[model samples]
Target chain A: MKVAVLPGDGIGPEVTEAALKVLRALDEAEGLGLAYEVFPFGGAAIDAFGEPFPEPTRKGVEEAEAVLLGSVGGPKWDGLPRKIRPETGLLSLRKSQDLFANLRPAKVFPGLERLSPLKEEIARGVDVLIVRELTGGIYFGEPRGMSEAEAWNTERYSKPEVERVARVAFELARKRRKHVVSVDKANVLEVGEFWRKTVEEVGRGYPDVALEHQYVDAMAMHLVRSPARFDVVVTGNIFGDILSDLASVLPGSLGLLPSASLGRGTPVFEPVHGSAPDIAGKGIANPTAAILSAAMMLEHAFGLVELARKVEDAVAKALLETPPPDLGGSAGTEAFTATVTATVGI
Target chain B: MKVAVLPGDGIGPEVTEAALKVLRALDEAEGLGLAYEVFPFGGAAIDAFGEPFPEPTRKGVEEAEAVLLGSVGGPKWDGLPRKIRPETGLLSLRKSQDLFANLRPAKVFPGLERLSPLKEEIARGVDVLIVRELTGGIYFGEPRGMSEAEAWNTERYSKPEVERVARVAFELARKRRKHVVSVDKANVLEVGEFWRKTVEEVGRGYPDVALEHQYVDAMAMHLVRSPARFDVVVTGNIFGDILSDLASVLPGSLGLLPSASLGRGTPVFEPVHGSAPDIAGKGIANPTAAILSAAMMLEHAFGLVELARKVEDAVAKALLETPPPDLGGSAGTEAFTATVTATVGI
Candidate 1:
């Protein structure tokens, strides 16, 4: 299998190396041959090829089976032309790849529950998977423009769009708790009502998955109060954008969360945290989210569930022993990566 | 000063009576000459006049300087037609009164902070005022509808709309912590970009108040993780609905929260919690939110800041002694109200 590696900027390359170290170790031990192609992207691409999403990198990503992206964007890119910004590179990549479903898994790691802002009991058992419709809904919806009197963006969804994301939630639920909560504002927005209807229609295909619906506002409150009560949550773009971020805090730090954008071919996996240019060369940036994104790549892209579990288990055990810099221990990014990689057995 | 009282459904009367009892006591003791005119609204209006927003009630509300609403809505009104539903009545009333700004204050009272779902350290000093634009944005934006293949809701905001809400938030920050966090999704949404621009322009007028911009998604995460870090949060209608509900849990119980909608004419004040019909006649309904809403009415509508402080101080002192059912002790609605009223002093 071929993997395209784009270590975008700042702590991006640092974390990417940690993830690659772990994946390479697993592939060699299991006797599974994996080839990696490195390319410049984001700010790196602009500095190297005069474009954030250079043509050569685009070809490399398209030829690979999957893409492992590290974080992107920094203050240095803050004043660049709108079209050449680091974020523009990511947006172009996702658009070109048609990555419509963004899956974010937020869970409290064992022994790290103490770091959560929620009460010990409420934060202890939370394991929520947020399936966000990435390419559509309010964010990318058309009829969006601004004038002196009004600025409007449409929150639109077709049946196919809702069904595809609903399937993603149902498929994820089957792997874990077999419970799917489709959240929408059915009482208010027509689009939400339509979304709820389409999700229900698709949910009928999965009899084993228990399906339910909740108003988005109520879901927000419940998420903070009883995050553990949820299993797989599916929603339209805007609500998903908000809820996924809200769920990120349940497990303590963004350092512990990873996300995947899947569709068409060559799914993109990355850490949820952005590049902290301040901590770029410190060698102490937490690589757990990056390594976890690699695990998601193994599971979803490579169809290796056991290998994914092994990666996750090794990460958990390592965090318990060699606590990372973010968790207050002195271990650097490489040291934490070595610990987890060493834990993965043949 | 005249206060229009609308004790609408089930627990509505239970809590409204509690607020009026305290206010009437103060009026008599201080010779403040405060008068109240009871009016039918919400489910109660639906039952009496066959319409939730009756003509007589409108006249009564317009004549009064302020409106004190208890909780509204119940299962009894759930089956009503969409146009005449209980919520429709509230929306119409707010529109007619031009209540564009909704003020929801989420603060942890002195001793009751322990009930917060957040950890003690993170929840202890949480005091945030969310200034939400109520009249405009996605909820009422034109060009919203459903088609055979798609359904869409427009999220539109004008420059003036953003400016008005920004001023409200800055005005509030001046009285509180002198900092305003204007939340938007300017990175993607054009409406959000315009919103940020307008907010910055309006903020220039209030040089005394500090202003900052944050995306709505990040705000949701930070609101839970470090709520105390924020002072006043200003945002459009949709984000406000979700964040305010999320913040409601930070204080432990919705019954301890209050909200006020401000605009061109008489402002409408009410408890954040809805009428819990199941707990309506149980006498165990917590009236703390209702009493707090009345405090807001005094300060905002009647311009009686000292009187508002007295009511708030009394409630704070009373809650420390006689805990409501929500906070675990056995005090019923009237019992809790009496305790707070007595603490107000002569």
Candidate 2:
């Protein structure tokens, strides 16, 4: 399997290196034959070619079966113009790759339940997958501009975009729990109403799955009030942006979260946590999310569920034995990777 | 002082009656001269006058010094067209009154912190004021439409709208704390950038209050991970709707919450809990929020800080000493009002 690796900016390289090490260990033990091609992206690409996402890097990802990206952007790239900015690079890459559905799994690990802001009963055993439609909605809709007296952005959704993401959520739900809660602001927004209608239409194909609707505001409260009650949640771009981050609190620290953006072509996996500029070159950044992203790549991109399970099991075991620096333990990126590598079994 | 009371629908009348009793008690004890005129609103108005917000009700509120509203909307009015729905009445009333800023305070009460979904250490001493711009943004912005393939809404804001709400946040912050965190999506949207500029321009007038900016997504996570770190948060209509609801989880139940919508002419105070159609007329409705709404009216409308304090102290004392049914106590709506009435001293 050809995997394109883009350790974007800040502590991205450190965490990516750790994930690569674990994968190498797996390849050696299980003969996985995973070939990784490193490509410059985000600020690194900007530094090398005066472009956040260079033509060569785009070509590399287009050729690969799947892509792995570490966190991107930092204060250093904050001054770049919108077109060539680090964030623009990530957005462009996702659009160019047609990566529309973003999957974020929020599960409170066994040893870290105490760190969750929620009460023990509510926080314990919390595992929910948030599927967000990444490309559409108010964020990218046209007719957006600011005038002398007013500013405006449109929240547009087509039936096709909504159906595709709904199908992704239902298909994924069948593998886990046969339930999906579609969230929107149907009471107020026309786009929300349209989204609800399309999602309902798509649900007809999945008779085994249970589907329900919740207003975006109510969903925000319910997610915190009873997160564990939900099996899977699908929402529009803007709503998902808020809900997924809100879900990150379930795991206590963003350091332990990983995400995947999938579409018709090459999918990209990355950590949920941002570049975290404050601790960029300290060697203390947590590598769990990065490693987990790699595991997700193995599962989704390569169909190596057994190897993915091994990687996930090893990471969980290592975490239970000792916490990472982000979780108040002293284990640095290197030490954490070594711990995971040591625990992985053939 | 004239107070227009709209005991809207379902359990709305029940809670508002309890509040009226407490207001009557206060007027008798302190000669506060609080005169109230009851008005039909929400589903009742839609049923009685064919228009959710009749000309007569609008005229009554136009003349009143302040307004107190019980929750509105229910299944009874669910089938109505958008313009005449129960929610339409509330929206129309606010728009006609120019009620632009919505203030929602989410604080975990002592002794009841256990009820909060958050862990004790994090939920303890949590207090936050979310000031949302109610009349502007996507909810009311024009050029909204639905089509065969696309549905869209405009998120529009003007300098005045942003300035008015920013002033509200800063002014309110100066009363309690000296900090305001302005939230927006400046990284992506033009409107977000405009909002940031407008808020910053308004901030210059308030030298005493410290100001900062946070992306809406990051703010979502921070609010959950470390709620106590915030004093006051200000954002546009959509952000406020989501964040205020998110904040509601910190306080456990909506029954104990009150909100204020301020405008140029007269302000309206109401409970955060909507019309509870399921428990309507069951006599089990919680009155703490409605009564607290009256307290806010005393302070904001009548400028009777001392009387407001008396009302607030009574509710707090009653809650801590005898905890209402909503908070797990055996006290009914009438009994809870009596408990607060007995506690309030002239």
Candidate 3:
């Protein structure tokens, strides 16, 4: 399998390099025999060619088996017009790729128990994957982000939009914990009520999947208090935004949480972080999340399961060291990357 | 000034005792004249009169200058019809009082720093008043609740709704640190965009006030990371539901926090805690919140600032003696109440 790599800017390249070594180790050990090409785009592309997301990069990404995006954006281009900004690049990438589902899995790993805000007990063993409908929901629904006076209000959802995502969550739940918590504000919002019932009815198709409902408020509290209570959480765009970031706390760093955008074909793996333009050339960036993004790329896109494992093991193993500065260690980015690469036998 | 009290149910009455005794001390020491009348309703009234929110109780609240309520509901009323539920009674009370602005203040008090998941520097001095437009929004928005095929979804806000609430927030910001953070998802939701633009346009009216905007997702993270950055926060209903409960974490307990629902005339004060049937009638529920409710009544509705001061002092002094068993302390209801009464000097 071949992958397209876009180390956008700043810490993007710094972290993606560490991920590549881990992936290489897995390819060798698991005999996956992978081939990949590297391209430039996003903040890096803008820096090099003056266009944040170059058309060539997009064409390269569309042609590959999968795409790996390290990170993107910075303050340097803050003055750039909205259409040329790095975020628009991402928005365009997701849209052109026809990527619909964004899966963000959050769990506190074994070695790092004290990092959570929740009392240790509730924070431990919290492994929930949020399958959010990316392309649809109020984010793209009609009457959205238009004007200031009238305001943006999009609570519309087609019948198919609800069921397609519901099926995906149920299928995933059946494979793992056999339980799915479909959250919606049923008692209040009509769209939420519509969501709650539709998800329940869809659950009936997969008898192996146990289903339940949680109001979004209670769910937010549960995320803070009892994160371990959920298995597969499926929700719409807006609620997903609040919950996903909070979910990142389980891992404790936005720099270390990896996300995958999957559709019918080629998947895109990326770190759930922004272009820290302030630290653009500084070598202090944490590389764990970008490494994990490579791992996600392996599993979800390229079918290199062993490769993904290799990357994750390296990440987990590096944490067992004195710990990086983000996790309280004085070690700089180079040392952390060295430690992670060493774990992968590179 | 006369204060009307509603020690609604469970330990509501027990906590009210601590509050009133403290008020008596203030009346004597500060020479602040004060009087009180207790109105009983909610689940207890339902048990006695077979009506959750009795008409006479509502009328009594209407006639009072201010009302203090402990809490309502327990396992006994969980399965009851909607109209007879304690939530209905609470809603009616808010509606009756026209407490359009709901003030929920969150501060990480000293000595209870162990509860927060954030670093002390981050959690410290997080005193922000979230002015929630309570009477309206999705909770009461039209075309609400469930439907046949799917459920209901209404994110409603009119020009009046936005204008009145924006004024409430901007006015409050002028009195505080002069900075107000308006929270919404303008990039996604129409109401959020409208809210953002409205607040920005409204800012032109209050030149002394400094206003900023934060997406609800980022606000959630800031609350988890560094809440002290916020001074006055304003948001719509559903978002407020999550944010307000989260604000309680700053204070230490969901039970430890109390809120005031203020309208055009009279205001109603209640604990931001749900009914805990487990310790009901066990003489162990924490009374600090109830006592605090009475203090809010004194401060807001009656203009008995001196009385309010005494109530707060007595309540704080009591909590310091030890948390009640409800809060993992050895003191029971009577023991905690005794400490509160003993703090009163006349």
Candidate 4:
């Protein structure tokens, strides 16, 4: 399996190293050879080669079976043109790949769990996968944005757009726990009405998975108050992005959440956090999320479910014992990493 | 001055009592000559007339200059006909009053400060008013929900819809603080483009308010991380409803916040909460939010700023001396109401 790697910017390299370590261990234990090549892109590329998302990097991802990216965005390129900025490269690459299904698994580990604002019982066993429609909706909707007296945005979606996303949700639901909750503003929006119709129809195709719909307001309240009730929650690109970010909070740390984007081309994997430039060279960045992303990449492309399970188990064991300093534990990056490496059966 | 009240369901009536005590005292103290007439609607109306939003109630609001609602929704009305649901009553009222400027102000209070998940600095003085363009967008958009396997809904917006809403934001910004943050994904959607273009063109007319634009994703992050930096943030209906609810967490108790819908006719006001059927007919329900809603109605409709401020001041004073039970105090709905009523500048 040829996987393209874009070690974007800031602590991207730091976390990427951790992910690679887990990937190598998976390769040794599962005999699944992931021949991955690291490429240049993001702000680092812009600083070195005058191009953020180079044509070569896009070509590399196009030729590969999958793409693995660390966080990308920082203050270094703060002055750069918005289009050529590092974050834009992410949107460019995703558009090029036509990757749509963004699966973010929000699971809480036992020991390293003080980060949650909600009480424990409400968050424990909160294992939910967010299946977000990546490509279309307001982010790609027509009648796009501009400057204003008081800024306002539009949320637009079409029949085909909603249908394509619904299919991804149904397919994923059939594999995991049998519950899919579609979150929308059906109580208010035309797009929501469309989203509900698509999801309900999609549910008919997968009888094994019980599909449900909820108003976005209710979902927002439920997400914080009783997050444990959900198994699989899905929504449009923008709603999914915001909801996924909030959902990760239930797990106690943004540093440990991993996500995979699946669609027309090679699947893309990354941690759901921005590049922290302040802690970039300091080397204290959390690696669990990146390592978990590697685990996802393994299962997504190579179908190495066993290897994926091993990586997750190893991480859980380490977390159960103790978290790193970033997560308020005494361990440093090296020690934190060694802990996971030591626990890996692979 | 005449103020209309709609105590819909659940502990709504209990909360309305607290609200009325303050409203009556503020009016009497300031000698504003205000009188209120209560209306029957929501779940109670559904039980009595088999309709959540009865035409008589609608007519009552139309005849009044200001309307204050204490919430609408309960288990008794579960699976109620579409038009009789609380949300339906809300939408009907908004459309009836031509209340296009939907303003939701989210601000963290002093005693309940730690309730926010963000840092102390960000949570303090964190007041943001989100103006949502009601009566249009996806809610009333074309091709209502369908039943096809590949279902779809259309998000259609006319030029006039964007113009009027943008005008409301700019005008409001000119009146309050001088900064306006217009949010959109114009980089992608056509409707977003309409929002952006309208705001920019609208900004030309109002040079006093500094207008800026941001994508919804970035705004969501900003909202969570640093809410104190904003003054007036505006977005679309769907985004507004969701964001406003999420912002409620910044203030801890949902029992304390209020929202208003403004337009050319009798403006509508409500507590931004649901009728908790589980707590119905119970006197322990929080009444602060209902009272606050009444304060807003008086100020916005009858130009009774002094009366409103005194009512608000009395509530604040009561909190300082004897807060409600949730905040580690002995005051319930009755005690709080009594205090607010007794200390009306006596």
Q: Tens digit of lDDT per residue, candidate 4, span B134-235?
A: 867655655544444333344556666777878888876776687889887676566667777777887889888899898775676566656678888777
**Candidate 2 on B190-308: residue-level lDDT in tens?**
89999999999899999999999999988988878888889999999999999988897788877999999998867999998888898888888889999999988988888887778
Clashing residue pair totals per candidate (backbone < 3 A): 0, 0, 18, 29
* Local accuracy of candidate 2 as per-residue lDDT tens digits, A1-346: 8999999998898898899998998888878788988999999999999988898899999999999999889888889788998999988899989988999998887766887888888888888999999989988898899987878888889999999999999998997889999999998999989999999999999999999999999998888888988998999998998899999878888898999999987899999778887888888998999999999999889888888878988888888876787788888888888889988952
Model 3, position B138: C-alpha lDDT score? 60
Q: Quality of candidate 2's docking, in CAPRI categories?
A: high
Worst 10 residues of 1 chain A by lDDT: A337-346
Q: Tens-digit lDDT track for model 4 on A1-346?
A: 8989998898888888878877776677767766988889888878877878887887899999888899887888868888888878888888888888889898876644445555445556778888888877656554433333222334556667777778877777766677889999776565677788767876788888888888876777677656778888889987887788777666667788888988888789998877888888686888888889988887777777776778888988887666776677776556777788889853
Candidate 3 Cα misplacement greater than 4 A, ranges: A28-31, A44-55, A117-124, A144-152, A174-179, B44-55, B74-85, B115-126, B142-152, B170-179, B201-210, B250-252, B275-282, B303-310, B344-346
Highest lDDT among the candidates is held by which one? 1
Worst window of 10 by summed lDDT in candidate 2 chain B: B107-116
List the pairs of residues colliding in candidate 2.
none
- Residue lDDT tens for model 1, B101-191: 9999999877776889998889988889898998889898877888868898999888878888888789878867899999999988999
- DockQ, Cα level, model 1: 0.87
> How do the residues B163-199 of candidate 3 rate in per-residue lDDT, one tens digit apiece?
7777878876775688888888776567877777777
